Ligand binder design. Structure first.
Ligand SMILES: *[C@@H]1O[C@H](CO)[C@@H](O[C@@H]2O[C@H](CO)[C@@H](O[C@@H]3O[C@H](CO[C@H]4O[C@H](CO)[C@@H](O)[C@H](O)[C@@H]4O)[C@@H](O)[C@H](O[C@H]4O[C@H](CO)[C@@H](O)[C@H](O)[C@@H]4O)[C@@H]3O)[C@H](O)[C@H]2NC(C)=O)[C@H](O)[C@H]1NC(C)=O
Ligand SMILES: *[C@@H]1O[C@H](CO)[C@@H](O[C@@H]2O[C@H](CO)[C@@H](O)[C@H](O)[C@H]2NC(C)=O)[C@H](O)[C@H]1NC(C)=O
Ligand SMILES: *[C@@H]1O[C@H](CO)[C@@H](O[C@@H]2O[C@H](CO)[C@@H](O)[C@H](O)[C@H]2NC(C)=O)[C@H](O)[C@H]1NC(C)=O
Ligand SMILES: *[C@@H]1O[C@H](CO)[C@@H](O[C@@H]2O[C@H](CO)[C@@H](O)[C@H](O)[C@H]2NC(C)=O)[C@H](O)[C@H]1NC(C)=O
Ligand SMILES: *[C@@H]1O[C@H](CO)[C@@H](O[C@@H]2O[C@H](CO)[C@@H](O)[C@H](O)[C@H]2NC(C)=O)[C@H](O)[C@H]1NC(C)=O
Ligand SMILES: *[C@@H]1O[C@H](CO)[C@@H](O[C@@H]2O[C@H](CO)[C@@H](O)[C@H](O)[C@H]2NC(C)=O)[C@H](O)[C@H]1NC(C)=O
Ligand SMILES: *[C@@H]1O[C@H](CO)[C@@H](O[C@@H]2O[C@H](CO)[C@@H](O)[C@H](O)[C@H]2NC(C)=O)[C@H](O)[C@H]1NC(C)=O
Ligand SMILES: *[C@@H]1O[C@H](CO)[C@@H](O[C@@H]2O[C@H](CO)[C@@H](O)[C@H](O)[C@H]2NC(C)=O)[C@H](O)[C@H]1NC(C)=O
Ligand SMILES: *[C@@H]1O[C@H](CO)[C@@H](O[C@@H]2O[C@H](CO)[C@@H](O)[C@H](O)[C@H]2NC(C)=O)[C@H](O)[C@H]1NC(C)=O
Ligand SMILES: *[C@@H]1O[C@H](CO)[C@@H](O[C@@H]2O[C@H](CO)[C@@H](O)[C@H](O)[C@H]2NC(C)=O)[C@H](O)[C@H]1NC(C)=O
Ligand SMILES: *[C@@H]1O[C@H](CO)[C@@H](O)[C@H](O)[C@H]1NC(C)=O
Ligand SMILES: *[C@@H]1O[C@H](CO)[C@@H](O)[C@H](O)[C@H]1NC(C)=O
Ligand SMILES: *[C@@H]1O[C@H](CO)[C@@H](O)[C@H](O)[C@H]1NC(C)=O
Lengths: 439, 125, 124, 439, 125, 439
């Protein structure tokens, strides 16, 4: 003979999707628009709570993706349009002081540019990197004058990633998985509750993930479905591999007015000789890293199978090559020097040649191009490789040899890689249970 | 010492009944203003929906409220020792999820009858 | 069977008073984003204004609340049989809309005096 | 000796204006911005409730009007501007295969158009309808170059009306009048409550109202003041009249780039003979329909009154003809063939010649012109005439004859026609009454 | 002969306590539009935060609420005639500002124990 | 043996910063999107309440400043972009009927302007005021063609100030200081509570503040730090000084089309002779006014020092000269004729010559210019000088003489001058106190 008793403040929850807001602490991400952070953020351990996580169905990724794109675009609104640049260019090769690796990489183009006054014209000479220039028939045009408008990125706004914290609204909570070696889809036996995520840097790259989180103990291999060759494999490393990238040519940057308060920046000249951009990966470190990756792959593919790595399969430069933003320049580095080996049961460096491109089309969109102003001087950056994106090279008639190639291009994978440990739930404080209390 | 916001999750139902203020106190606590503003509006909206039910059921000022609706064994055929000592609130919520709409309807009905009866008794003097 | 949201309208006051939970439960239930937010905020604001008055009058937890303010025949001199059986709430609202502000002021005053008296008694 | 008792949840309401929101279930109504509809919409009957309605003072009409215009404008923002077309055109007559229905209607124009590069021009030939083109002195210009910018409508966005449901916010309700033959201004003895209206198709037309609701039993004559000759009369029919419209000429549509990702669409040629656009109305059906309308008018004007119909009095095509959007083309049909009879106490049809116009100034605004790109192929559409907009002309000391003419052009009349049965009220749940209960 | 919204400010605490409804009734009473909308939301949020506290302390239905928490001479070593007759509420707020969190914590704790005790007594009957 | 009693509705508050909203009883300052005011606003007196006010830390000033700038910019969005005017101008002097004082002030310029059709040009003649035209080698360009775009102010929108009331949101209140002769930073013994401020006209000027609120009894001198010569001094007069400003030339305004839907306005010619704009200040009134100011300044500077006034020190016209908007025209008046005297222990007037400028750069911004269209006819206005901005220039360490010069240009000072008596506070209705009541 029991009665219903109503309780409010009951510690239960349901899976939920909601709007998360940005918290943070002259940048693309407009971090001044984000909520100041708590210097002493909370995290509480939940004893005896097991919660299912699924990183592949995690809406937080989708929402982060949309926010990054929107911030990107807002930051290009108050900038110079380069419409006046879609003219016929008269171009010759830059061959004075070059190495052979750069032969045919740069072109010296002249054109009739507008001036502050609309009844005047000026002759301008500038250098281009070839990837940005296409022949029309010495007559060239910028590569995108038949598909998109070009906006010059503002020279005062940094492209250096700044950590972003995602925060739940009141009534919601973010659960975090603390289970070391968690792969992203099973039940997580050890969880905690947090107010906001840790800071995540929106680093943009393909193939090799840079400046992310490391695995706690061992390389962790995660995929939506490991036996489905149509899926990407995200490999989280348990130690960084250092990569050193440079653009060695000393660039002199010039600026002209093309309109009423509208300046255009371009490479004027090069001091010293002309050499290619490149990245260095320590060779011994890279070989140890692959050995760890191969060992973990064997656990899913079989006893004494053969694992080989191969270069990318082809297609657009943006996915066949390792793209990244270093010093503000956009690099496209060839990784065939890394993914070329067969694994069956010193202190030199691996040099990866790189190309530089100024007309950029991010997020795989068409119709919105950006022009990256050249940067004065010589560029060097050092970064950590914290993970890989790999794909299986189709299937086979039980050949017993598996092949993996670098993959990427879908930005949601980079963010999924960092957000894999978080889940959003809705708090449901009201509930009932029987007892002996009547009224 | 105290536990944090969901610290009692995983504790038994009995033990967790002692942290109700911990959870209650955290409710309500260009375009980038639209997301924040929607988030704020939504937190308020959800809060009020729950308060509205407590009002209707006659539990408006309480964290723990006893009503006059008897428990039907068909909703959960368990004894008190088992429910309060060997279960967590998450487990309980799953077990009786189907019956919450029924229970809520009964709570609303009981309170409405009670209010009418009180009105009549006061007039009857 | 039950009536829908305003299904009691048109029934007499004495019948309609039994459906109060039906109506109570439906309260709170680019630019266009702004337009939609305004609609939601407004629903909340109206809800809270009514709850605030119930609070002030000492009716915060009830759908039916009896007070200590006497009824003045000057507002209406109809007998109870006529009011509760031969009138609807819409008709009633029209009949006494001119005295609503007066009544509300009296309810606020009465409750304030009652709270003070309770405070004094509990100090003995 | 009675006491005041407070009741909350009292079923009363009072007239109110508020903000209503859109529910709907690629196009100009941005329906993705609306919420899903209630799959099981409720409607409740209110026994013994009599409410007053006034369709002429109904704020829902004004709000629908504003929403439609705003949605319309938003759909044109991300589209190609046609500023470069304000050039002198060199135009001659199309005389190739003319059936003399269109003698001189089309003109063959040529001009020097911009290209992807700003230093290159191209010669373009295209056809126009002599409504869109005005002589300047063989030299012509587009008609809107001296008043507005012209924007090309996006070819990917449909103009086909989609039912829209208006929904009240919580705390508000929409009352619906179910009284058959209700004229819109008196008390309505039979009402019901809904949260959302039925879906209303935002069909835009003049003189004849297409694809609306039908009268339940008999033709209904609705007006703000029937004896006031300054008011429009809305007529709701109790049976549809079918109208079949066509643009028989088979158009070949060409496209050129006029700038960096900026495409312009135009009619290149006509494959067969050139014939006028036209609409067919069954003659017998039309004659029966008018007889019903006249009978109902007699109830207001007298049993010895002669009722005659005449064509429109004059003004711009937007008010003198029946305009509509058929397949995406904009038609201006001459209705003098319908409104020509005197009423005093087979299987053929009425053919209405129609003109086609590409540069459209909607909502009677100045400064915002739309260019409707031509549609490839041959167009046919079939629609229902569900109501009419008439005006009563003249006046007299004493006369026996009244004259009615097609009217309208004020879009709020079309929406008023569909929304005539809905009213918005605010719920007022708190109130008091005397009783015997004290405390 | 009433005072306006803050008209009692400056009067003594024992006088100002008679205008609590005056102050209570005024609570809750182009990107140029968001300005206004945020202000409306904020007013609601503040109102609800105060209501949440009255709720958890067991004072939800009243302007004047007596509790079971004793007053500590540490918080304020004053006699009642001094507090109620020679001080305004503004002065009082300053005098005990550093102890309000202590007091709030105690009020919350007392109410939680009280609700549990009521539940047990009803179960015994 | 006392208990804690909780009270709600306690009349206490804290200093606070919040968002205030616009309220107000075709114009630059929006009224159409501002909240309608209370025709009979309340104000209550608080007996025995003393509050600390600090006008220099008053957030209301910063917020008003941002609102005025944002409204200003919004009013210029739907207007003509005069991009086509940055052309080489061929200019000669206007010599027809020139008073000696204006030789060199007007220039007769001609240029090839665009027109409705893009393949045509038109020759245009217009007059300019020199300050807005710069020589480029008879060849001139508009002054801002190397820094900014020019937006023509819409001719239909008035620049006349309309008083704006700032209102607190619920939960907040505005306290007002009624203490006559309050200097803005000390305790104020007499305060009242309002929900909205009085109406404040957003009058924009430098050096002399026009059309403000006068001191109740005596001239009041206020500054953040009176002995700090880096701070400005605001002087509030207790009597207005009337100033009569004119632009005597009779201007004939012309309009041409520069593109589809876009008209440009300019001065065509002048009827009658050319005389300069000027302002008249009653001489006797001005001498009495300074005597009052000096007497009050003396309270901070011995009793017996010499106080002298001098003209501005130099810098841009915006700060060296008195600027205001009269009739919609923009004037820059020379005040050296006012601030030129030494004070030691007749129906005449002072005439201040004024310059006119059409290319305006307000709020000290760079990159956003406005073109003020000319006004047809002759302009006259009468204003009330209600206050002054002085700078106690000279970092003198040993002197018996102090020098004051006109200052200003930072608009927050004018608003601060009007808002000095208001403070925003948050109401904190919940509190506790000991009583003898237990339960
Ligand atoms: C300090 O405060 C004073 C007083 O408020 C301001 O002086 C006013 O300034 C405004 C703007 O210059 C003046 O407004 C204009 O008045 C002209 C004359 O009005 C009289 O004569 C006409 C004859 O047709 C009558 O209809 C009218 O009722 C008056 O009897 C008008 O001709 C002007 O109209 C033109 O401009 C407006 C605005 O752009 C257009 O909307 C009109 O269609 C038309 O083109 C205009 O109304 C006002 O008269 C002045 N008041 C006084 C008492 O003189 C100072 O300007 C202010 N100081 C500062 C720095 O702001
Ligand atoms: C400019 O660079 C291009 C690209 O390297 C040169 O063209 C190539 O010439 C080689 C022979 O030396 C051919 O085998 C390649 O097929 C050509 N490639 C292309 C894309 O045309 C070109 O000769 C150089 N011109 C000058 C003046 O130095
Ligand atoms: C820059 O513009 C000038 C014209 O202003 C171009 O020079 C002309 O080119 C044409 C061929 O297209 C010749 O027929 C003319 O005789 C040239 N005129 C002169 C004065 O030389 C010039 O080629 C353009 N240069 C670039 C790099 O685009
Ligand atoms: C998690 O579960 C363990 C049981 O597996 C709980 O441990 C018990 O705690 C009570 C109360 O302190 C002790 O009396 C028991 O002796 C403990 N049992 C064991 C086996 O150690 C633990 O308290 C739970 N955690 C939480 C937060 O509730
Ligand atoms: C609407 O009016 C009808 C009367 O026309 C009401 O129906 C009556 O209700 C009483 C009380 O239950 C019965 O004794 C009568 O026999 C009923 N009359 C009929 C004709 O059935 C009805 O209750 C009113 N209101 C609503 C909401 O239905
Ligand atoms: C629509 O119907 C209403 C009645 O329901 C008509 O209203 C009456 O109009 C006459 C003439 O002006 C007045 O004397 C009556 O007092 C009105 N009655 C009511 C209840 O308002 C209205 O004229 C009709 N309109 C049309 C076009 O048919
Ligand atoms: C402001 O303070 C004065 C005292 O300085 C208050 O006036 C006193 O009120 C009491 C109670 O009615 C009388 O017995 C005294 O004789 C009054 N003194 C004087 C000098 O008049 C006044 O009420 C206070 N104002 C407010 C709003 O509290
Ligand atoms: C047009 O205006 C210019 C600028 O005032 C005149 O040039 C100046 O003339 C004065 C004599 O009146 C000289 O002292 C200045 O040195 C001249 N300025 C410069 C920069 O040389 C010019 O003479 C005027 N032209 C006409 C026809 O009146
Ligand atoms: C405005 O009045 C305040 C007094 O309310 C003056 O402030 C005092 O200035 C003296 C200077 O010797 C200091 O020693 C005091 O400590 C200051 N008191 C306070 C409360 O700030 C202030 O200087 C006056 N300012 C002007 C411009 O007249
Ligand atoms: C107000 O301004 C005076 C300057 O007139 C400031 O006083 C100076 O302070 C510095 C730093 O301590 C000393 O080195 C100078 O000798 C002081 N000058 C004089 C004339 O005494 C004063 O600090 C300012 N007040 C405030 C509150 O900032
Ligand atoms: C063989 O299988 C066992 C069990 O899964 C595993 O531990 C071992 O590493 C495998 N050996 C090889 C060569 O893959
Ligand atoms: C194009 O420009 C040339 C310039 O010489 C002119 O002769 C020709 O008539 C123009 N063509 C058209 C169609 O206007
Ligand atoms: C207009 O263009 C012609 C081109 O021949 C040029 O000679 C003339 O000087 C220009 N006119 C002006 C006022 O600049």
């Amino acid at each position: 003979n029991l009665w219903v008793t109503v309780y409010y403040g009951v510690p239960v929850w349901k899976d939920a999707e909601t709007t998360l807001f940005c918290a943070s602490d002259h940048n693309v991400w407009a971090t001044h628009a984000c909520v100041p952070t708590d210097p002493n953020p909370q995290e509480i351990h939940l004893e005896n709570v097991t919660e299912e996580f699924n990183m592949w169905k995690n809406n937080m990724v989708e929402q982060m993706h949309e926010d990054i794109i929107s911030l990107w675009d807002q930051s290009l609104k108050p900038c110079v349009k380069l419409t006046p640049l879609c003219v016929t260019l008269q171009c010759t090769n830059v061959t004075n002081n070059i190495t052979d690796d750069m032969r045919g990489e740069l072109k010296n183009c002249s054109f009739n540019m507008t001036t502050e006054l609309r009844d005047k014209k000026q002759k301008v000479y500038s250098l281009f990197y070839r990837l940005d220039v296409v022949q029309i028939n010495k007559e060239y045009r910028l590569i995108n004058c038949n598909t998109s408008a070009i906006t010059q990125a503002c020279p005062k706004v940094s492209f250096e990633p700044i950590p972003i914290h995602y925060c739940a609204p009141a009534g919601f909570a973010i659960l975090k998985c603390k289970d070391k070696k968690f792969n992203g889809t099973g039940p997580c036996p050890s969880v905690s509750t947090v107010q906001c995520t840790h800071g995540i840097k929106p680093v943009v790259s393909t193939q090799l993930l840079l400046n992310g989180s490391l695995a706690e103990e061992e390389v962790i291999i995660r995929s939506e479905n490991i036996t489905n060759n149509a899926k990407n494999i995200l490999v989280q490393l348990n130690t960084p591999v250092q990569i050193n990238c440079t653009r060695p040519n000393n660039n002199t940057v010039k600026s002209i007015r093309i309109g009423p308060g509208q300046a255009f920046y371009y490479t004027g000249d090069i001091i010293g000789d002309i050499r290619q951009a490149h990245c260095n990966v320590s060779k011994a470190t890279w070989n140890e890293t692959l050995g760890k990756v191969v060992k973990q792959l064997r656990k899913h593919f079989g006893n004494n199978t053969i694992i080989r790595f191969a270069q990318s399969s082809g297609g657009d430069l943006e996915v066949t090559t390792h793209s990244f933003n270093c010093g503000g320049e956009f690099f496209y580095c060839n990784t065939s020097g890394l993914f070329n080996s067969t694994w069956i049961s010193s202190n030199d460096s691996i040099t990866l040649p790189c190309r530089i491109k100024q007309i950029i089309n991010m997020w795989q969109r068409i119709g919105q191009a950006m022009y990256a102003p050249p940067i004065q001087g010589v560029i060097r950056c050092v970064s950590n490789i914290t993970g890989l994106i790999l794909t299986r090279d189709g299937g086979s008639t039980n050949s017993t040899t598996e092949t993996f190639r670098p993959g990427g291009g879908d930005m949601r994978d980079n963010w999924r890689s960092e957000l894999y440990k978080y889940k959003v739930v809705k708090i449901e404080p009201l509930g009932v249970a029987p007892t002996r209390c009547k009224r | 010492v105290s536990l944090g916001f969901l610290g009692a999750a995983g504790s038994t139902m009995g033990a967790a009944s002692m942290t109700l203020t911990v959870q209650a106190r955290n409710l309500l606590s260009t375009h980038w203003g639209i997301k924040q503003l929607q988030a704020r509006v939504l937190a308020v909206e959800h809060y009020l929906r729950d308060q509205q039910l407590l009002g209707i059921w006659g539990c408006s000022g309480k964290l723990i409220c006893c009503t006059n609706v008897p428990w039907n064994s068909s909703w959960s055929n368990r004894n008190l020792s088992e429910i309060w000592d060997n279960m967590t609130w998450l487990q309980w919520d799953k077990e009786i999820s189907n019956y919450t709409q029924i229970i809520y309807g009964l709570l609303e009905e009981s309170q409405n009858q009670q209010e009418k009866n009180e009105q009549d008794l006061l007039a009857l003097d």
